[PDB]
Symmetry: D2
Subunit: 29 residues, 4 copies
Amino acid sequence: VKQLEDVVEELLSVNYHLENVVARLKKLV
Amino acid sequence: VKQLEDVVEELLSVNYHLENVVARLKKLV
Amino acid sequence: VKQLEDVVEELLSVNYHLENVVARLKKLV
Amino acid sequence: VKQLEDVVEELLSVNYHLENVVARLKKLV
Ligand code: NA
Ligand code: NA
Ligand code: NA
Ligand code: NA
Ligand code: NA
Ligand code: NA
Ligand code: NA
Ligand code: NA
């Protein structure tokens, strides 16, 4: 688990970070 | 543009799809 | 596990699919 | 454009970062 919950942490951040870049793209475009 | 807005469409879907898989992972884990 | 390996499957596909949309964006842009 | 190529930069990094977290998950799991 302890390794798994650290992957989950990094996935949460990657996912938030993609959603902010996609919102920025969508108003650029 | 017309090519750009189709990339934006696919990014929106990829991003939603990642958020649902991450929510599922986070309650599995 | 069986639930975990199905999340892993979906993540693999989401990740491939993002890499193809990013390659397409990068040559559009 | 200059705004677009900065989105592209951030997408490249998000995509690399997801692929490393997915590779780590897949060998955890
Ligand atoms: Na932590
Ligand atoms: Na940003
Ligand atoms: Na459409
Ligand atoms: Na799903
Ligand atoms: Na399968
Ligand atoms: Na595509
Ligand atoms: Na730069
Ligand atoms: Na990492």
